[PDB]
């Protein structure tokens, strides 16, 4: 019920943009924005990566904001897979994406347009992917992709609910991706190109972010841990997968793992974002979920239209 007035402020902000009262800038190569409406688990990350993969015959650069990083200012995190900074400096997300996408460039920058210019100067990418870019209207995108999970529809605005913008804002989108289909499937019809996203369990990632068979977990029990607070969602996934934990450690959300002291011979499971902090530790893994999108080729055709 402060959500009523938050709605009024956001609306105003959107009207300023609609009526040309707030400046909008444009990069000289196509921009694809991936975003959502809600705070909380989104699949944005999974989908940004999937989308980068689809562009495998294009020089791709991801524009990410970083969130909490040990540095300040526009920063090239990775040059087509060549990592230039540590995860501390990069921020968890952009680093994780740099690690998993060896063909792609990643830039961390609060000033997104500026990040874009720096990339062009130094990397000459053919396409930008604007990570979490739906509300960032000051940067023009040629393809505005909006992610929606079933929960979003039954949700409210902040501070009551998790919505950053009202549901009506869905109409700004060029295309919709309906997430978490594997667990909470739903349909949605707007006339907009619309795609169903599934995530399914492939295998493990070792600390080198190479793929390792889920098989090694058999008749083994693991020690599981994580930080960034998200400490039962993980427990939930592990349970659903029939994975036998034998203790669950929960570290503070900043935890840098410098004094992490493993038990010899024991198998550890943690999250992809914790794992980036434990490069080199063997017998430490994260779960690897792949994205399958329905009508991938349609999606591909839609994306490739930005190149004309």
From Swiss-Prot:
One of its GO terms (molecular function) is tetraacyldisaccharide 4'-kinase activity. Keywords: ATP-binding, Kinase, Lipid A biosynthesis, Lipid biosynthesis, Lipid metabolism, Nucleotide-binding, Transferase. GO terms for cellular component: plasma membrane. Its EC number is 2.7.1.130. It comes from the Bacteria. ATP binds at residues 38-45. The keyword Kinase applies. The keyword Kinase applies. Pathway: Glycolipid biosynthesis; lipid IV(A) biosynthesis; lipid IV(A) from (3R)-3-hydroxytetradecanoyl-[acyl-carrier-protein] and UDP-N-acetyl-alpha-D-glucosamine: step 6/6. Pfam families: LpxK. InterPro entries: LpxK, P-loop_NTPase. It catalyses: a lipid A disaccharide + ATP = a lipid IVA + ADP + H(+). PANTHER family: TETRAACYLDISACCHARIDE 4'-KINASE, TETRAACYLDISACCHARIDE 4'-KINASE, MITOCHONDRIAL-RELATED. This is Tetraacyldisaccharide 4'-kinase. It comes from Aquifex aeolicus (strain VF5). The gene is lpxK.
